[PDB]
């Protein structure tokens, strides 16, 4: 699409933690509509977000965010009493800031990047059970002028599953040749993984796109990741390669053999996918 | 050192998959010349490569490449019917492109980098058996103006082996002090590793060399890598450190202890290596 | 903040390998004062360091450094006889260099970075026993103009411990809001880890700080690391987030559950830490 605007808006959302079928737990923006991964939160540097949070579960839960600014009262840990008791409510406050020159001449890094939020108190005091059960979601913070995508897809390697899905059950994502597609890639649990995409590649830097001819970042199609790592990128679907059912998978061999695979289904403008028969 | 020219040539090559001794399999450019790792393929951005492929083994095999442009018919997977039956032949086509500005002003990244190719169908439909057996090889794509090396060596951490060699059997690589030496480093299998070189270091970026004083890339001598990761770099052999049998190894302690170790043998101009006495 | 000057000095230090309580082993700059991690060595690009080394132990030991310039005789390995026999002495020499252009015009990377030293011969020919026992320490090489910190803290994930400490025993580090705090982060052993710091973030590049608005490095608060990896960064304590007990931990879930955790204790300018009430 276009470009991200300058931030500075004070935003507000309601968030709920809720049980889902099969022992799962999820975040949602409306009661009864929790999802795994949780809802995508998008902010422009400078924006503030007040998360009006409610725990609808029978066990305590919390909300811990990576990368963004928050005071200790929004750490989301039992250790500083910022979790939410069953049936309880709490306002978590997330802030973001633009980069800038400090008075002493140093450069303050901004909040922009591919981040995520997750539980920190279900099962253990590091949220091992909550994360296992699905209490995680993506956060994107944009810098003014960042290129905006046609669509964004979140892929979470959570131990031996993608997005808590059963082995060999996706997710699949659909695009048309030429679409600007953004991927947010988060890892959770116990294991390291390597994320691989067939037919596409990106830059190993903040936006996943080279800034121009002077950017020396490695261009990659395979990336090692460990628990609580996050990164993201944009690709032009099918660019230089055409339509097709382009696989993505963890490249740890036993993981790909045991279901950590999905498809990036890139259609021609006429809606067909060459060589794909499901 | 020389410099890579602009690409745009159409090239052909023949490649075979063959069984090797002891359950191994490898790729080669000629029959009976299969090797692990497979042959090094070097391209300049814009080059097209037609790989005339032949499966001489008794089980299906394929060729899947990282990084390069290919249509879905050269994916090299059973899922897309781009594998090769026993005794069969197939032409895989790889393309590359230069970076440049798109119609809308965004910057399209080029193909240049350190890449690799491997099997995708032996044992499992992700090539777990074929990769284990040795079916992997390096691909280098160069950008116009890239610095060219005096020699290139490929180091593959394939599970707990280097290049499928028996434990504690190298490989070793020879150079003379001052040689410009290129390393392609690929990882395969189940395990993470950390690649370490004694006496040398490189930049954690596309070429392994800093572009100049503005490049903030960390300079490293140790790098974590996982299955199907690839990177590469160039060093000046012995620069600031002199001749010697310079160790490289995985730094995961049990892996180095079990034999994931080799030597970068850097000779003085008279050909000697001080303090080198292999046992 | 201060700024690093150009290097070029020749320095010498004594270092000792010593047994410590509980079967541990450490390096120290004075006899009887070994520590785990070993002493922080700081150099400016161009400096030379002569390490006058003594093995006080009953087993061979060595000193292997990452990143810095050294000849094969200071490799610290048995195979080229650069280890130190029990009771023995040896001078290890480390050199560093500035970046610049070679005679052919190519750019040579300098020595600056976050590095480390460790044993290479105790237990195995790769120092597996020595590293496990505590024979590791940090080295920082600074480039002219690098920002200098108010304090530097070294965090080593040595297998399932931080700095060889028992589980759930820190270390904790103290600062005041606004302090410029440098972290050196080293990993050793058999396992991968992911280092995470609550409330703070850094740039994934040489210094951990962006050079300016044109540096495209990812800004992160979580980093995967494996044996013998080293990186570092600086943060302004509490910047944009305030005082408090800010946790750092490995984010591998069973590792944090088993106590690879510590606290960055950031005090208010009046000396208090909000929300931090540790049990007696
Ligand atoms: Cu935490
Ligand atoms: Cu995996
Ligand atoms: Cu986290
Ligand atoms: Cu694949
Ligand atoms: Cu290894
Ligand atoms: Cu692959
Ligand atoms: Cu070594
Ligand atoms: Cu850990
Ligand atoms: Cu080491
Ligand atoms: Na980088």
Author numbering:
A (entry chain A): 40 to 317
B (entry chain C): 40 to 318
C (entry chain B): 40 to 319
From the paper:
Laccases (EC 1.10.3.2) are multi-copper oxidases that catalyze the oxidation of various organic and inorganic molecules (e.g., mono- and di-phenols, polyphenols, diamines, aminophenols, aromatic or aliphatic amines) with the reduction of molecular oxygen to water. Substrate oxidation occurs near the Cu1 ion (named T1 center), and electrons are then transferred via the Cys-His pathway to the Cu2 and Cu3α-Cu3β (TNC), where the reduction of oxygen to water takes place. 2D laccases are homotrimeric proteins, with Cu1 ions of monomers lying in one plane at an equal distance from each other and forming the so-called equilateral triangle.
Based on our structural analysis, we propose that the side chains of Met 199 and Tyr 230 can hinder the access of organic substrates to Cu1 ion. The activity of the Tyr230Ala variant toward ABTS and 2.6-DMP was 4 and 2-fold higher than SgfSLwt, respectively. Met199Gly and Met199Ala mutations led to a shift of pHopt for 2.6-DMP oxidation by 1.0 point, while Tyr230Ala mutation shifted the pHopt by 0.5 points. Met 199 is located in β-hairpin turning into the loop (203–212 aa), Tyr 230 is in the short loop between two β-strands. The side chains of both residues contact each other (Met 199CG–Tyr 230CZ, Met 199SD–Tyr 230CE2) and form a side wall of the substrate-binding pocket. From our point of view, substitutions of Met 199 and Tyr 230 to residues with short side groups (Gly, Ala) can increase the mobility of this region due to loss of contacts strength. Indeed, in the crystal structure of the Tyr230Ala variant, double positions of Met 199 and Glu 229 side chains were found unlike the other structures. The residual activity of Met199Gly and Tyr230Ala mutants after high-temperature incubation and its optimal temperature (Topt) for ABTS oxidation decreased significantly compared to SgfSLwt. We suggest that decreased residual activity of Met199Gly and Tyr230Ala variants at high temperature could be explained by increased mobility of the Cu1 ion environment.
